């Protein structure tokens, strides 16, 4: 037997998830040429400098995004953390489109992001409650019996 | 059982990649002390801002090459991955070194990396679309059916 | 069966980790409210750019930390790589406090924070070694047999 079928759908929004970051990545290059920033250096005009910044963030926020996607999607369940992660991503590219045109526009995308990745820790805190909080009571339980 | 050894390459790659942006980290704190840039403050000499820009798009690339590596080498195929994944982590080494010498230096191994790491995106999405479109046409197919 | 089990420690260490970076995420937030610097941008006072520059480092190392937690907690052991990886994050923790006051404070939790990191890196290393190394020497000597 295999587990593939198990992280099917985390693989596939975390794949969608890498192609968006390259579509970030080829959106950066393009400001650079358009408005003329050679390597290195990351300072120029406002337009460059929001594109650039969104691309930042994003990249920062990535991994933060994949390991909850994956600790709720194994721990609390597939489906809910994979729709999860599509609202973050989708909320993601409307957050990098936003900012790329102005530092307000970025802002009601951000917030939906925010509100799914707080969502994906949840269902991970949840899951990983559901895993110990159980045997731990059980366990404090029989220390308690004892009495006896 | 254990599932160790469907995934021991990908963790050894894994494993020398983070060693490998360790030594990127390491060259970034020399630089630090032989061009005199004081933390905080990522501003300095060209050959500094270049070896601390090199660090920084390897860092921002090392989640993605995780990802994929990992995608690819569960739903694709182990040892193909691995292989990817030993051509792109060589490939930004000497991108590192590239990049620190000069800026047009980073750009064949950086050309080399992008390859690599391409190829590893078309190896997930076509494991992952062997995973999925069976049994999709499959459903799609029993609709039509359906008639009767 | 499940693996859930393997690797619950793991899990709860790595999404204690995420909560961290979090946090560090809101303190960024509050040091551009307290320091007045609207995005993008990353300049301002020194205090500001020591909070950012922690927030950005915490963020730089996260993937780093992540990949080797499970790569040591699958390979050597689940209950050490946790243990180490709780002393990394508290570590981090100290390290981003210290920063944030002052860039000197930064050090001593630094140091901790690396020895730890270090240690799961090892731990990767010596799991990984097991693995490979026997069936390897063993393939070795029966080509040397081989003879005969
Ligand atoms: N923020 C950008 C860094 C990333 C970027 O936009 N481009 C990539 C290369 S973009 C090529 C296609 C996208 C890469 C990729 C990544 C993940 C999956 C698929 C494709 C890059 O290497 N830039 C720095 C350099 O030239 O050394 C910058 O610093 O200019
Ligand atoms: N780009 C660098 C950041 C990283 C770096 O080069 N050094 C590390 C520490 S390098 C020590 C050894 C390598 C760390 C490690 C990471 C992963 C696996 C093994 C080792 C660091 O913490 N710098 C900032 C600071 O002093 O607060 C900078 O901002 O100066
Ligand atoms: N270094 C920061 C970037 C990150 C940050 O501090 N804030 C987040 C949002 S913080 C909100 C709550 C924490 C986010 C989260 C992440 C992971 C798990 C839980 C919560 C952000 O999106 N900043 C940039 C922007 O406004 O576009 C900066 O560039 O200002
Ligand atoms: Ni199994």
């Known amino acids: 037997h295999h587990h593939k079928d198990e992280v099917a759908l985390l693989a596939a929004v975390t794949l969608l998830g890498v192609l968006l970051q390259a579509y970030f990545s080829l959106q950066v290059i393009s400001a650079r040429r358009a408005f003329r920033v050679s390597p290195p250096l990351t300072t120029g005009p406002p337009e460059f400098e929001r594109v650039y910044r969104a691309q930042v963030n994003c990249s920062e926020y990535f991994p933060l ?25 989708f909320a993601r590219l409307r957050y990098f489109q936003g ?19 707080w969502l994906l820790v949840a269902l991970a805190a949840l899951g990983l409650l559901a895993h110990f909080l159980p045997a731990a009571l059980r366990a404090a339980l029989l220390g308690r019996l004892r009495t006896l």
Request: aromatic letters at 16%; glycine letters at 6%.
């Open 99 to 117: 900012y790329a045109r102005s530092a307000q526009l970025r802002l009601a995308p951000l917030y939906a992001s925010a509100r799914a990745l």
């Open 65 to 89: 995004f994949l390991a909850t996607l994956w600790v709720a999607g194994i721990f609390f369940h597939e489906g809910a953390a994979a729709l999860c992660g599509l609202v973050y991503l």
